[PDB]
Amino acid sequence: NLQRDAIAAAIDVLNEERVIAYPTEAVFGVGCDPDSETAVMRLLELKQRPVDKGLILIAANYEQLKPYIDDTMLTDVQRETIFSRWPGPVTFVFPAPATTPRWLTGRFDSLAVRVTDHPLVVALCQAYGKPLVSTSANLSGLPPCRTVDEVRAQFGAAFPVVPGETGGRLNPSEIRDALTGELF
Amino acid sequence: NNLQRDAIAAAIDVLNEERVIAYPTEAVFGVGCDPDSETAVMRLLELKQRPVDKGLILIAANYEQLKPYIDDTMLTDVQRETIFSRWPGPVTFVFPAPATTPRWLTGRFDSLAVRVTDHPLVVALCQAYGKPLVSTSANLSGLPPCRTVDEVRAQFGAAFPVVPGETGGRLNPSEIRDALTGELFR
């Protein structure tokens, strides 16, 4: 019930249209309600990141991501190639419908997404009912946090953070284009 | 006219036989066929000695005729305005294409080159046909393009089905842009 309790409070923060920290594969990440422009702007403000660069969506399964992307051009063989890498630590850039909020796409007609296998995040997304905008937990110019204590050191002792351990993975970020397979 | 009407009627009969037809374009004469028929397209590729993996161009009387073969859902309203400001016209645009679009049209790509032409004859033909036409220049491999009905007969045969009329006048040609960038494709 600990994790259950942690996810519950986490959902409360998300519903408040606020940013929350939580463990991911290699480091902790910070994220929010992708559907809320106010929440996303709070995340960008916190990371001092320009809205035109675009954000990443992390989810428990591909179904949660589909409404934000357009995979209709991908042949069954291309899909098999992409999907063979999920769930996993691989982010894919997919074209995105014009209906997807520009605060997520940035100045592109695409969106970077990932189906994670990190247990905590999968549980969180499954309970929240949708994907989370997800980026590394760190202030501009600071290195990513690998623990709850490190998140508190950078973001403040009262910054909302889900307890747990990262996956303990030290393989750099791998981002690929869904249409090519080429590193993005 | 009534001969244009008749010319179109016979052209549609050939198209329905899953066969290739020739007709005037803004440039020189072109040849085309039913895009929905793998048999018709293979007949055109064989005729042009063109490999299927290159992809083909679709010409239509209006954008609605092309929508079924392409995916424009990612294009914002400003990008669309940028593309449309150039149609009808001599500009061809490459759009991503759903996996449902036949591979004998896309070639080895997940996109399709299309154009809303302003050539009256072709516009009328497509309007009557009810869908776009695969369209390429009327010339056998290694030969110059045909500019008149007579030149088409010399190259494709005296009985090759050809719609009469005059070429638009616009010499040719073809600027090809990417719907996603608005810039030149490649």
Side-chain angles (χ1 to χ4, degrees):
Chain A
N1 289 63
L2 301 185
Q3 198 187 72
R4 185 171 299 148
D5 283 350
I7 293 175
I11 304 286
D12 285 344
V13 176
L14 293 169
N15 292 328
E16 278 155 26
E17 225 167 3
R18 294 208 287 160
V19 176
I20 186 174
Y22 48 79
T24 59
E25 301 91 343
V27 305
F28 267 65
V30 283
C32 63
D33 180 3
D35 298 331
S36 169
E37 174 173 32
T38 293
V40 171
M41 294 307 282
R42 281 170 183 168
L43 173 123
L44 299 181
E45 179 51 282
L46 184 68
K47 299 267 300 188
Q48 303 192 345
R49 177 181 181 88
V51 68
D52 59 51
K53 281 177 170 54
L55 292 160
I56 301 169
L57 265 52
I58 188 173
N61 56 246
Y62 188 61
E63 279 68 25
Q64 300 189 306
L65 302 169
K66 287 180 56 56
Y68 302 86
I69 58 178
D70 172 3
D71 69 6
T72 68
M73 72 287 298
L74 299 171
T75 64
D76 282 341
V77 181
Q78 293 179 300
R79 293 188 189 195
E80 182 197 352
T81 305
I82 294 176
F83 302 151
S84 67
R85 306 181 106 305
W86 281 339
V90 189
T91 303
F92 282 94
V93 173
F94 282 76
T99 55
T100 297
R102 306 338 273 179
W103 55 78
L104 298 179
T105 62
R107 58 182 183 284
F108 307 100
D109 285 359
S110 56
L111 182 69
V113 304
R114 193 177 93 234
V115 172
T116 182
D117 56 29
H118 187 68
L120 179 287
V121 178
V122 167
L124 177 56
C125 288
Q126 282 172 164
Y128 184 48
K130 59 182 175 181
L132 288 182
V133 153
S134 200
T135 185
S136 57
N138 63 263
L139 291 185
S140 178
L142 295 183
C145 296
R146 100 167 74 197
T147 67
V148 168
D149 290 316
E150 293 192 6
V151 169
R152 284 171 179 156
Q154 293 193 199
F155 298 83
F159 191 79
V161 49
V162 177
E165 249 72 272
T166 54
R169 170 155 221 283
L170 67 85
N171 271 18
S173 304
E174 186 184 357
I175 302 175
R176 291 181 181 295
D177 180 300
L179 305 175
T180 307
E182 205 77 6
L183 292 180
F184 204 68
Chain B
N1 310 301
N2 249 334
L3 42 271
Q4 192 188 72
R5 172 279 238 97
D6 290 350
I8 288 175
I12 293 176
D13 287 343
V14 176
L15 287 171
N16 289 321
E17 288 159 0
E18 302 198 295
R19 287 211 292 155
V20 180
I21 53 176
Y23 49 82
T25 62
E26 50 284 272
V28 291
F29 272 67
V31 286
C33 67
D34 178 4
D36 300 328
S37 170
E38 178 172 32
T39 291
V41 172
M42 294 307 274
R43 285 174 174 171
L44 175 133
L45 294 180
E46 178 64 60
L47 188 286
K48 294 277 298 188
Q49 287 299 72
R50 182 188 176 85
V52 65
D53 78 318
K54 281 193 164 190
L56 286 163
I57 296 177
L58 264 51
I59 197 169
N62 55 255
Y63 187 60
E64 287 83 358
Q65 292 188 313
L66 300 166
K67 289 184 61 46
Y69 306 84
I70 58 177
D71 176 359
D72 66 3
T73 63
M74 72 289 298
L75 298 174
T76 64
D77 285 338
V78 178
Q79 298 177 299
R80 295 193 193 209
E81 173 179 8
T82 299
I83 295 170
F84 301 152
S85 69
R86 312 209 69 179
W87 282 335
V91 192
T92 298
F93 282 92
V94 173
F95 283 78
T100 51
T101 295
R103 310 334 276 181
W104 57 77
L105 291 180
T106 63
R108 66 182 184 74
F109 310 98
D110 283 355
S111 57
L112 188 71
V114 302
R115 194 206 324 156
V116 179
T117 185
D118 61 3
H119 191 74
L121 181 283
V122 176
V123 167
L125 170 57
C126 288
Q127 292 183 315
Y129 186 40
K131 56 182 181 182
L133 285 179
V134 159
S135 198
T136 184
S137 57
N139 66 284
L140 269 16
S141 190
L143 300 186
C146 300
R147 304 155 291 180
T148 65
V149 168
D150 286 36
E151 290 186 354
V152 168
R153 284 170 180 158
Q155 233 178 279
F156 301 80
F160 192 79
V162 52
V163 185
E166 230 65 347
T167 50
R170 182 189 193 64
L171 269 187
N172 194 30
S174 319
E175 179 183 315
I176 308 175
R177 266 116 149 50
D178 186 320
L180 296 173
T181 69
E183 87 190 310
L184 299 178
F185 185 67
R186 195 264 178 60

